[PDB]
């Protein structure tokens, strides 16, 4: 076998990433808005 690594004669094959030679593009699921809020919880505030 050649996948496995033996750390005595540096026996370790060199292979690329199969997802970088060929870019299977599909977009990205973003149906929901990903919001970011204030740190306190309310921003603007008045007086009453």
């Amino acid at each position: 076998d050649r996948t496995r690594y033996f750390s005595m004669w540096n026996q370790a094959v060199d292979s690329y990433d199969p997802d970088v030679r060929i870019i299977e593009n599909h977009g990205t699921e973003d149906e929901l808005p990903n919001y970011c809020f204030p740190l306190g919880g309310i921003g603007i505030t008045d007086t009453f």
Binding site: G43, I44, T45, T47
Partner: protein, 113 residues
């Protein structure tokens, strides 16, 4: 008023109700000293013609000059145009003023200024 995110920063009476058309609320908020608040209001009102430019409003805050008909003047001159002594506005000597301190308390009626 503008620069919406101003209400989260600390503020400047001069960076809200001077260099900008402001709410008396932000004015009220920044002033609280309601006596001087009325003073600043009186200013704004009289300075209605001194809204622009900025240094004009600064001078209208100084108050040494009378604006228009003289509603804003706050100096120390208490003499008539011809050197006659000015009668006390509140006092009835020698005339009982229908228009006096009670009717116009917001003008800061001094001794005889």
């Amino acid at each position: 008023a503008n620069t919406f995110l101003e209400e989260v920063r600390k503020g400047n009476l001069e960076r809200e109700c001077v260099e900008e058309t402001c709410s008396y609320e932000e004015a009220f908020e920044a002033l609280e000293s309601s006596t001087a608040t009325d003073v600043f209001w009186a200013k704004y009102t009289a300075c209605e013609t001194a809204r622009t430019p900025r240094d004009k409003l600064a001078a209208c805050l100084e108050g040494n000059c009378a604006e228009g008909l003289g509603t804003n003047y706050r100096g120390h001159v208490n003499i008539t145009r011809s050197g006659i002594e000015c009668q006390l506005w509140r006092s009835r000597y020698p005339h009982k003023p229908e228009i006096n301190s009670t009717t116009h308390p917001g003008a800061d009626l001094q001794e005889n200024f």
